[PDB]
Structures are given as C-alpha cells and as structure tokens.
C-alpha cells in the first residue's frame, strides 16, 4: 500500500525467488540478510547484481527478495533472473538492450533422472571384452 | 516342492520371525515386495494385465 514497486519471479533448477524493486538506497536484502553476508564473499554475488549495472547504470533501486530451494549458487542465480525479470517489468523500453544481454529465459535445465543400469544418468560404470 | 513350501508357510511358524513374504498367485519365494505381497513376475504379468491405476509407464 506504500510507494509503487515492481516484482519478478525468477527460478533456476528447482530454486525459486521473489524480488521486489522498491526504490531507495539500492542495498540488497536476501532473506532479511545482506548479500555481502548471506553468501560470503562471494564475488559471484556481483554477477547476481550485474544485470542492473549492464542497463544504463544506475538507479539504484532497493531490493527486497525472498528465495527458497536449491543451493547457494542456485538460489543466488534465482535472485539474478528475478531482478532481471523485475527490471524487465520496470520499463518496456529496456527490453531491447536486454536482447543483447540475454539474461532472461531461465533455461529450465536441471540434473537428469537416472537411467536404469546407469549410475550418472548417462555414465556406465564399466565394460570389458572377454 | 512349492506345494510343500506354501504348506510350510500357511501353517503357523513356531516363531513369529519365520514368516517370509510370498505371493498367492505363485508359490515362488524370494524377491517378493512386502507392501503388495506380489511376485515381481506376478506383478509384471498383472501389470500388463493392468490391475491398478495408473500410468504406467516410466513417467517423471
């Protein structure tokens, strides 16, 4: 009911995130924790924050995001796609530069179900003639 | 000797631990799932026959 804000769901490999681009200081908030703190250190977190920097740079909007599922890198990637789609919902006009950026889609991929007779859902333990 | 075996099983064991699982449709012991008490082959042939829902086969 406060000042208007955009939001964009972003999942990857069974890890879903809910970003909220409320305008402000631009400090990021993941599960009531700083991104510098929630995943130390971790440099990749800057890659989670890259799409906003690749687009004009910079607001910068404050982010309140709630993520669940997956590992740390996966949920962080969910934060990335989630701020990306939210940035997509910011203005329609930005989407053009975004085609150059890729940085959307969330390509669905996840580890394959194991095949019978196979350990790695592809790998075969051994073969031996005679 | 399957008739002797099913006769051995249907009769009450001297000790409760003794009661190994076996399907009724066939007298073969061993490799019988406990939850449905069916033969793997018994359940196989019934699966082609189709006894329970549903899908069948190799989903997810």
């Amino acid at each position: 009911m406060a000042q208007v804000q955009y939001y964009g769901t972003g999942r990857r490999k069974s890890s879903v995130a809910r970003v909220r681009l409320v305008p402000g200081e631009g400090r990021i908030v993941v599960n009531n924790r700083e991104i510098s703190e929630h995943i130390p250190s971790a440099a990749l977190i800057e890659d989670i924050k890259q799409p906003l920097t690749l687009t004009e740079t910079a607001g910068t909007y404050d982010v309140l995001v709630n993520v669940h599922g997956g590992g740390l890198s996966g949920q962080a990637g969910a934060i990335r796609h989630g701020i990306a789609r939210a940035l997509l919902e910011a203005d329609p006009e930005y989407r053009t530069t975004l085609k150059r950026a890729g940085l959307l889609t969330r390509d669905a991929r996840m580890k394959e179900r194991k095949k019978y007779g196979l350990k790695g859902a592809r790998r075969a333990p051994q073969f031996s003639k005679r | 000797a399957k008739k002797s075996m099913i006769a051995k099983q249907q009769r009450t064991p001297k000790f409760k631990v003794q009661e190994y699982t076996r399907c009724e449709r066939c007298g073969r012991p061993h490799s019988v799932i406990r939850k449905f008490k069916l033969c793997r082959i018994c359940f196989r042939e019934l699966a082609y026959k189709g006894q329970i829902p549903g899908v069948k086969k190799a989903s997810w």
């Binding site: - | 329970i52 549903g54 069948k56 086969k57 997810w60």
Partner: protein, 102 residues
C-alpha cells in the same frame, strides 16, 4: 468470528474419477446450501517401482511402473442439515476416498 466447519476430503488413483467425484460431491453442496468452497489442489504423491524384465538374469534391462496418489479438499461455511441428509446417498463413484470431519 472463527468457527469449526465440515471439511470433506477426497482421494483417488484415477483423476477423472476423482474430479467427477468432486463435481458430484460439491453439486449436493450447492443445492440446499450456501457458500460452497471449491476443490483445492493437493501435492499428490506417486510411488515408483522398478522391476526386472527377464525371468532370469539380464538385470541391466528393467521397467518403472508407478502409482500416483491425488488428494483434494472441499469446504462449506454453512453446515445446512438438509444437504447433509442429501449427502447420505452417493451413486458414484465406486472408487473414491471421501472423508468427513467437522
């Protein structure tokens, strides 16, 4: 303002039988009744089973037959006794797991 309410639940293997049963079980709720909540989805739990193809060896080849288990819930704010007396009769389906609780 909160109060205990009857909350019938359904469970079945086949789904067409299940939601046909859902429509039949809410249709009685609609007549001689009020509000009538819809049949909300539940996560559903399948049971996988891998079995050998061959009677003998060749364990490298198998097959996976599985049995999913759907679940559903239905609610109504007004107990309405007349549709409860109507509830006693259920011609369909033979394959359903209705459960009544208040």
């Amino acid at each position: 303002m909160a109060k205990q309410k009857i909350r019938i639940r359904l469970k079945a293997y086949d789904h067409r039988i299940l939601d046909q049963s859902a429509e039949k079980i809410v249709e009685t709720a609609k007549r001689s009744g009020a509000s009538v909540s819809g049949p909300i989805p539940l996560p559903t739990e399948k049971s996988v089973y891998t079995i050998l193809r061959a009677v003998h060896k060749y364990k490298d080849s198998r097959e996976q037959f599985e049995m999913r288990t759907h679940k559903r819930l239905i609610d109504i704010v007004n107990p309405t006794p007349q549709t409860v007396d109507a509830l006693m009769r259920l011609d369909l389906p033979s394959g359903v797991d209705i459960e009544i609780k208040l």
